[PDB]
Amino acid sequence: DLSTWQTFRRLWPTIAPFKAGLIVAGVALILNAASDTFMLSLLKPLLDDGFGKTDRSVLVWMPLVVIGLMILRGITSYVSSYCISWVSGKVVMTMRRRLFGHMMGMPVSFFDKQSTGTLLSRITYDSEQVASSSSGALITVVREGASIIGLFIMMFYYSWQLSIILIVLAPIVSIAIRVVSKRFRNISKNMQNTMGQVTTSAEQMLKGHKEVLIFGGQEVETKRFDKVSNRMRLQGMKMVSASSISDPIIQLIASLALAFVLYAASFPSVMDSLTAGTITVVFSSMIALMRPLKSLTNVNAQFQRGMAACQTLFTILDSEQEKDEGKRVIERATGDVEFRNVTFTYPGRDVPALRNINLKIPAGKTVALVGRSGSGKSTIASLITRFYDIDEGEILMDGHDLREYTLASLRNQVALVSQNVHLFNDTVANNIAYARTEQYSREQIEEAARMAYAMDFINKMDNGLDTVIGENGVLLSGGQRQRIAIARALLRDSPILILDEATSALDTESERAIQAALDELQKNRTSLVIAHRLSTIEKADEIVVVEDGVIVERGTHNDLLEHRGVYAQLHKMQ
Amino acid sequence: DLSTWQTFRRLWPTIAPFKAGLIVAGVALILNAASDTFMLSLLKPLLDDGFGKTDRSVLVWMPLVVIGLMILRGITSYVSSYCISWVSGKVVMTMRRRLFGHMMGMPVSFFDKQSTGTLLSRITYDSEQVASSSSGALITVVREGASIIGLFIMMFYYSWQLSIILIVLAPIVSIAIRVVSKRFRNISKNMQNTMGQVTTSAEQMLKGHKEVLIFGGQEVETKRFDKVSNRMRLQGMKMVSASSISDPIIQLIASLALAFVLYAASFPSVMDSLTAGTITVVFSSMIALMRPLKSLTNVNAQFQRGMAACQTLFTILDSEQEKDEGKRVIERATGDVEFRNVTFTYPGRDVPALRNINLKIPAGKTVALVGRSGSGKSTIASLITRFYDIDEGEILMDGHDLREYTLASLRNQVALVSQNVHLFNDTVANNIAYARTEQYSREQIEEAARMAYAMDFINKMDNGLDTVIGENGVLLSGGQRQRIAIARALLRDSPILILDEATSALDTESERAIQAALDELQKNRTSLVIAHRLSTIEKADEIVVVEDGVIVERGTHNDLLEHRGVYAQLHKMQ
C-alpha cells in the first residue's frame, strides 16, 4: 500500500514526456485561483468605501470588472481542465498499452493457472477506473485545492489574528484525510478483486453456454452470480460508509474555525482594529471555504479508487515475463531437432511427465509419436516450441542448445496445428494468413487452402475467402475448422512442422487427400506428426512409441510390425 | 436517446420497492439544505446588530448555534447520502442480476454471431459506469440541487428587486445544461462500443494466445490494440472538451445576474431601503450559489454517462430471448425421436444445410451417423436438442413435437458430449456432476468416471477427484478432457445420449473399453452416435449415411456392406 503522493513519484517517469503540457495547466490553475480569490475579496470595497450618501465611486465601474474577471476565470479554467485531461488521457493510453503488451508476453505457465476473467478485468476495469479518476476527479481535486490555498492566503492577508486557528486546524484535517484515504484504497483493491470474480463468472457462463443449456446449469450459475454481485455491492457499501462518515466529521472540525473567529471577533478589544468590510469578508471567506473542502473530501473517494487501481497496475507491470534469455537469432533452420536425457515436470506437480527422452529428428524427414492417450505426446511438441522450459537435460536445434536462440527467432521456425484448434473472429483469409497478412498474396493463401482440401468447401460459402468465420469458427464444423488450421500451418515454409492430431475430426478420404498433399509438398521440410490413426503414419521415416512418458520403441513401420512389440498390439486392433 | 427524467420514469418500476430509504433520504436532504442556507443567512444578524452598531454586541450565542447547526447538517448529510447509496447499490445490483440472467437466456443463434468481448463489456464496463454515476455523482448532483433551491428561496425572501433576474437566467442555464447533456449521452454511448472493441481485442488475444506465439502475432495485435485504445482516448477527449466548454459558459451566464445585482444597488432613489446586512447577504448568496453551479455542471459528466449506460442496458433487457413456448412438461421421455421432411437453413445462409430428412430413433436402439466432414450431422444433434428451430418440418419426441415441450423440461431428456468440448475451471468432481452437484454423491461420480475409463488417470493426479482442472481443462490432455466429458454425459441417466465424436482423441483400446462399458447401458438407453471411426459403431442398430445434405443410405452394418453403396467405399478405406 503506497501513499497517494508515493504513487505519483512511482508514476512520474510515465508523465515526464508530457510535463511541457502541464506547466501551462499549472499556471492556468494558479490564475484561476487568483481570479476566484480576488472576486471574493470584491465584497470588501462595497461595504467600506462603496456605501455613502449618494456614493457610487467604485460601483460606477464595478460590475464590468466582475464580467471581465469572469471571462478570465472561464478561459483559464478551460485551458487548465483541457490540458490536464489531455495529459491524463495520454498517460492512461500508455499504461493500458503497456499492460496489454505485457500480459501478451507472459509465459504459458502463467496462462494455465489464471482465469480469463481476472485478466480481462485488469484490461477493462482497473484501467477504466484510472482513466475516470484521473480525468474527472483529478481536475476537481486540484481546482478545489487551488481555491482553498487562495482562501488561506487571503484570510491571512486581511487579518492574521482572526486566522491563527487555521494553523491548528490544518493538521487535523490532513490526518483525517490521510487515514480515510488509506481505507478508501484498501476497499478499492478488494472491490477490484470482486469485479475480477464477477467477470470471471460471466465469462465462464458465456464461454460454456451450450453446456449450461444442455445440463440445466440455470440455477447454479444464477446463484453464484448472485453471491458475487452481492459481495460487490457490500464492498461498495463499505466504501460509501467510509466516505459519508468522513465528510461530516471533517466539515464539523473545519467549523471550529468559524466558531473561533466569531468568538474572537466577539471581543470588542479585537474588532476595533478592523472595519466592517474586513470582518464580513473574513466571515464570508470562512463560510465559503467549507464548500471546496466538502467537495474535495467527497470526490476523494473516486480519486483514491483510481490511485489504488494505478498502484495495482504498477505492481502488475513489474512482474517477470517469459525468459527471453536467448541471444542468437536465425532466419531458417536446416530442419534437425535433437533431444538428450530431457526430463520435464509440469509446474505444480510431483511426478515428471517425461523421465528421459533421447528422441532425434533428422533433417528433412518425418517422425511420428504414436502411443497411449495419456503419455507425453503433446508435451514433446510444446517443448520443441519452448512453451515450457526443461527441468534438466539438453534439447538441441541445429547443434546449438534451444536456450541460446531468442524467442522470436525460434517460434518463427515452427508451424503448429494444435489438437485444440483455435480460430480468430475474422475472415477465412485472415485466419489462414494470421500474422503475415501483408506478406502473402491471395494466390498463396488459395494455394495453401487447396493443399489442405479446404478450397472444395470454401467455394460453397457465401463470399468465398471473404466470409466471416464467427467467434471461434463456430460457423464451421469441426472438420472444416481443422482444415483451416492445417492450411494456416502449411502456408508458411517453416522447416519444422508439428501436426498435433491434424486429422482427428476429418473422415478417411479427406485425410487421405491431406496426406497426399503433404507427401507431395513436405519432401524437404521436417515434420513431427502425432496421431492415433495408424494410417496417417505408416509412411513415417521412424515411428516412436511413448507410453507412461518414456520412449519404448523406435523404428520404421515394417521393423516395428515384425518386432511383435507394443506397436504390433496397437496395429493389430487398428 | 431519452432524457434524464425519461430515464428515471422508465427505471422507476425497478426502484419502487426501495422507497422508505428514498423518502427518509429526501427528508434529510431538505433538512440539510435548510441548515446550509441558514448558515449563510447568519451574516445579516451580525451586521445589522453586532459589529454594525456595536452598542448591542451582547450577541455571543452565534458560535454555539453555528456548531450545533453544523452538527445537524453533518448528521442529515450522512443519513441522506447513505440512504441514497443503499437504493443506488440495490438497483445497480438488480440490474446486474437481470442482465446476467437475461443474456444467459439468449438463443444460440445470437451467440453464434456476437463476440464474447462485447457481452463481457456489457456486464463489466457499462454496469460499473451505472454504479459509479449513481453512487458518487448522483448524491453530489442532488445535494447541489438542494443547495441551489435553498439559496433561491432565501434570496427571494430577502429582496426580489435584486433577484427577479434569476427568473430570467434559470431558463438559459437549463437550456445549456440540457443541450450539453444530450452530447454527453451521445459520446458515452459511443464510448461503450469503443470499450467493447477494446475488450474484444484483449479477449481474442488471451484465449488465442498460443496462435499469437507460434505465428508471431505480436506486432499485429499490438497495432490493433493501439488503434482501439487511441479511439477510446479520442472519444474521452471529445467528452472532456464538451464538459470544459460548457462549464465556463454556464458560469459566465450566471455572472450576468451578479453584475445586474451590483448595477441595481447603484440606484439610491429606488434601492434606498437596503440595510448594510441585507445587501451583503444577497451578494454572498450570489457567490455561494454560483459555486454549486460550477460543481454541478462539472459533475454532470459522470451522471450523464451513467444515464447513457442505464439507457443502453434497458434497451438490452427488453430484447427477444429464446422462444420457449408450449407448456407440456415431461418427467422422463421414452426417447423416441422422429423427423418429418425436415429442412433446416442456418441463420444467415441461403442454401439449406438439411433437406428432406426422414430419421427414426426408436427407444432402446442406437442410430449411427456417418459421412463426409461437412454433411449435416452435428446439425441433426443440435436440432434434436432444439438449439435451432426447424425451418419447415416436424420433429417428434415421445409422440409429440419438440415445439410444444418447454425447453427447460426438454434438455433434461438429452445428455450430449460434443466435439471441441468445453470444461469449467473447477474441480474434476464438479465438472463431472456439473449442475447437479448436491444430487449425485461421490460414489456415483466415481462410478461415472469408472464407466468412461477415466479412473486410471484421475486417480494418479495429486488430489484425485478434487484436483483443479484449470481454465477449459488445459491442465489435461485432449483424450483426458474427452474422457471427462464422456463421464459427465454418462453420469446422468437421461434416455437420449448423443455422442458427437465422443472418441475423437483416444487411442484404439481406450475407445474399445469405453464402447464396451457403454454397451451395458444400451439395453434401455436410446443413443445417437456420431463417429468417423467406423470400427466404433459396427454394432449400431441402424447406420445412417448422411452425404452433403440428404440421407443416402440406411440399415445395419451387414445390409450396407452387402449393398455395395457409399458405405462400402467408406469401409474399404479402413
Ligand SMILES: Nc1ncnc2c1ncn2[C@@H]1O[C@H](COP(=O)(O)OP(=O)(O)O)[C@@H](O)[C@H]1O
Ligand atoms: N499444462 C499442464 N499442466 C499440468 N499437467 C499437464 C499439463 N498438460 C498435460 N499434463 C499432464 O501430462 C499428461 C500427458 O499430457 P500431454 O503429454 O500434455 O498430452 P498428451 O497426453 O495428449 O500427449 C496428462 O496426463 C496430464 O495430466
Ligand SMILES: Nc1ncnc2c1ncn2[C@@H]1O[C@H](COP(=O)(O)OP(=O)(O)O)[C@@H](O)[C@H]1O
Ligand atoms: N452456427 C452455425 N451458423 C451457420 N452455419 C453453420 C453453423 N454451424 C454449422 N454451419 C454450417 O453447416 C454446415 C454443416 O456442417 P455440420 O453439419 O456442422 O458438419 P458436422 O455435422 O460434420 O459437424 C457447415 O458447412 C457449416 O458451414
Ligand code: VO4
Ligand atoms: O465435419 V465432422 O463434425 O463429420 O468432423
Ligand code: VO4
Ligand atoms: O494423448 V492425446 O489427449 O493427444 O490422444
Ligand SMILES: [Mg+2]
Ligand atoms: Mg494431445
Ligand SMILES: [Mg+2]
Ligand atoms: Mg460435427
